[PDB]
Amino acid sequence: AQYNANHPDFPMQMEQLERYIQRYLVYAILWSLSGDSRLKMRAELGEY
Secondary structure, rough: OOHHOOOOOOOOOOHHHHHHHHHHHHHHHHHHHHHHHHHHHHHHHHHO
C-alpha cells in the first residue's frame, strides 16, 4: 500500500505483487519460526 501511495500514476501490478508476496512469505516464515534460534539453525530451516 505504501508503494501504491508513492506511485499514484501506476500502482502495483499483479505480477510484481505475486513476486513480492511470494518472497515475503518465505522471509516471514524464516523470521517467525527460526527467529528464536541460533544462526546455524536459521540456516538449517532455510535449507529445508
